[PDB]
């Protein structure tokens, strides 16, 4: 006799993501050598950490210019990977193919004014549950950093992952718990002759930034 087998219902159809491999039909092929080719990446978050890309401010520019009036808000946007400010970053371009993230997102600020142009800035993370601060003074009570210009043109700041749940969504729907994470607030404290000078800002993934659950959702 021969081995009896139950061919089971519910199993066997093609699944577009399944853990199995096709049957081979054309053997023995040997490839050209490609060992030590320059520029290999393994993990998309390696390049999301090592290469910051530019944010987008009103007008379709990667910078904010120092204003000279009584309004000290240079920028304010939603801590969302779906923000308009983030929409040209490599980070937002990756995040759209995943439904959840966790961890640190880093902002980089570069002063671009002449040597006789001086300024002092503040970045604050405003968590959800009340309205984002409109003044450096109200913002002082948030997790914040302040710095000024000098030899070193760049300052980098980690936006912290603070939420009730352990993961939050990359997509947004309508303002909820799982999809808005508050605001980031960029203020100018003062300046000395920096009128018109640009501060350009970039974002990169922090050391514990994590994207999980692949999704394809039309989009680019």
């Amino acid at each position: 006799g021969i081995f009896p087998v139950a061919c089971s219902d519910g199993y066997g159809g093609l699944v577009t993501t399944d853990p199995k491999t096709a049957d081979p039909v054309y053997g023995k092929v040997f490839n050209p050598p490609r060992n030590q080719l320059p520029g290999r990446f393994t993990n998309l978050l390696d390049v999301a950490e090592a290469c910051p890309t530019f944010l987008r401010f009103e007008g379709g520019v990667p910078y904010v210019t120092t204003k000279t009036d009584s309004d000290r808000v240079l920028a304010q946007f939603d801590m969302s990977l779906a923000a308009k400010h983030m929409s040209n970053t490599f980070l937002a371009g990756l995040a759209q193919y995943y439904t959840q993230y966790s961890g640190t997102i880093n902002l980089h600020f570069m002063f671009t004014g002449p040597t006789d142009a001086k300024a002092r800035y503040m970045v604050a993370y405003a968590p959800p549950g009340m309205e984002p601060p409109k003044t450096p003074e109200a913002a002082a009570h948030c997790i914040h950093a302040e710095w000024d210009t000098g030899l070193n043109s760049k300052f980098t700041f980690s936006i912290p992952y603070l939420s009730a749940a352990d993961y939050t969504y990359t997509a947004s729907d309508v303002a909820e718990t799982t999809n808005v994470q508050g605001w980031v607030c960029l203020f100018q404290i003062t300046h000395g002759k920096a009128d018109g000078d640009a501060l350009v800002v970039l974002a990169s993934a922090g050391k514990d930034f994590e994207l999980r659950l692949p999704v394809d959702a039309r989009a680019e």
Partner: protein, 46 residues
């Protein structure tokens, strides 16, 4: 090594299931992301 999750070995030889690679004689962006300055460049008070 990608998205495959079978615990038993392939019924076919590796020479058949895949092209074979040859030598002559992560990687860059891993090294690049590891090399990142994580410190502080000031002096820290308190």
């Amino acid at each position: 090594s990608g998205n495959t999750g079978s615990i038993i070995n392939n019924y076919y030889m590796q020479q058949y299931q895949n092209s074979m690679d040859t030598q002559l004689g992560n990687d860059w962006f891993s090294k690049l992301a590891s090399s990142a300055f994580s410190g502080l460049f000031g002096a820290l008070l308190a």
